[PDB]
Amino acid sequence: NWESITKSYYTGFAISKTVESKDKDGKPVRKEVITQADLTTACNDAKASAQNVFNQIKLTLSGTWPNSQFRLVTGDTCVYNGSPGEKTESWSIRAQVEGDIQRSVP
């Protein structure tokens, strides 16, 4: 029997990288790129952040409930505030994962 203590978002970031190219008329163009692989990495960072927090919080939980076991239930996929692509100016995407800290209840 698992019961949620607290569920919140944990964040990872996909940061744009500068890319140089030329247009159809040969004019040089400067772009700021975020790829789909960058979003996946940012989501893995969000999941690792949730685990990192759980690892510290569990130190207190074992004192609050010494007869319980604890777990972190992380969302399978993230919710993002942007899509991969290219932009004129430097930019980022936030990958948010739900991290639910739970305890077993007798």
From Swiss-Prot:
Chain segments carrying region G1 (Gly-rich linker): 69-87
Stretches for region N1: 1-106
Cysteine pairings via disulfide bonds: 43-78
Localization of this protein: Virion; Host membrane
Assembly mode: Interacts with G6P; this interaction is required for proper integration of G3P and G6P into the virion. Interacts with G8P. Interacts with the tip of the host pilus. Interacts (via N-terminus) with host TolA.
UniProt free text on domains: Consists of 3 domains (N1/D1, N2/D2, and CT), a glycine-rich repeats and a C-terminal transmembrane segment. The N2 domain interacts with the F pilus, whereas the N1 domain forms a complex with the C-terminal domain of TolA although with low affinity. The pilus and TolA binding domains are independent of each other in stability and folding.
Functional note: Plays essential roles both in the penetration of the viral genome into the bacterial host via pilus retraction and in the extrusion process. During the initial step of infection, G3P mediates adsorption of the phage to its primary receptor, the tip of host F-pilus. Attachment of the phage causes pilus retraction bringing the viral particle into close proximity of the host cell inner membrane. Subsequent interaction with the host entry receptors TolA (low affinity) and penetration of the viral DNA into the host cytoplasm.
Family affiliation: Belongs to the inovirus G3P protein family.
Protein name, per record: Attachment protein G3P
Organism annotation: Salmonella phage IKe (Bacteriophage IKe)
Species classification: Viruses, Monodnaviria, Loebvirae, Hofneiviricota, Faserviricetes
Annotated gene: III
Included stretch of the parent chain: 21 to 126 of 434
